[PDB]
Amino acid sequence: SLALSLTADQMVSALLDAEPPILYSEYDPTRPFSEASMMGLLTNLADRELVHMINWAKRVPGFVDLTLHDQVHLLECAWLEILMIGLVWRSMEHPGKLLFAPNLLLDRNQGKCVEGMVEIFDMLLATSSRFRMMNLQGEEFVCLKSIILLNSGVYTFEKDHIHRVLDKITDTLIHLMAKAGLTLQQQHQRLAQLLLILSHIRHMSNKGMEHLYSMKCKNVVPLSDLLLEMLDAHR
C-alpha cells in the first residue's frame, strides 16, 4: 500500500488536496423555517455532500486498497460522523451558530424547529466551541476526519492494513503538533484531547441516526434512495 510510504508532510498535503468543496444550500425557502422546510434543505444538502464525500474517501491514502465491500462498510458506518465533523469545522469561526452552508447559518432557536434537533444542535455547538478553544488547525482536522472514516467501522468487520494506516495518521498528527512547537507532554496531551472528541462525534451521530430514522417513519420529507441506503445500514 502506497499510503505507508508517504511522509507526514506528504500525507498532510494529500489530505488537504482531497478536501471536498463547501456546498451551498438551496436559496429557497429562506428563513424563517418549518420542520418540513428545515429538513428539506438539510436533506438536499446532505445528499449532495455525500457524493463529494465518496470521492473524497477514495482519495484518502489507504482507502482504495480495501475491497469494495469494505469500502462500502466504512462509508456506511461513518458518513454522518464525517458530515458532522465537517459542519463543526466550518462553524468554528461562527461561535454560537452552525454553518450548514455559507447561505444557511443557523442558531439553536431555529433548532427547536424539528425536535429533538435542539439537543443535537447543542452538542454540535459545544463541539465547535471545543475545537475553537483548542485552536484546531486545518491539517489536524483533515487527519481527524480520515481517522473517523477508517476507524468507525473497523470493529464491525486485512484489518491490520486499516490499523497500520491509522498509526500513520497518528504519526502525522504528532508530526503536525511537534512542528507547531508543542512540548512532548503537550503533544500526547493534545492527541488524547482530540481523539476523545471523536467519541462525542460518534455519540452525536448515533443520536442523529435515530432522528433521521424517526423522520423516515414520520415521512415528513421524502428521502433520497442514497440517503435511505446509508440510513438503512444502521437499522
Binding site: L68, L226, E229
Partner: peptide, 10 residues
C-alpha cells in the same frame, strides 16, 4: 443493488 457501490466504482 446499492447506489453506494456505483458511486464508489466511478
Amino acid at each position: 443493488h446499492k447506489i453506494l457501490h456505483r458511486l464508489l466504482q466511478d
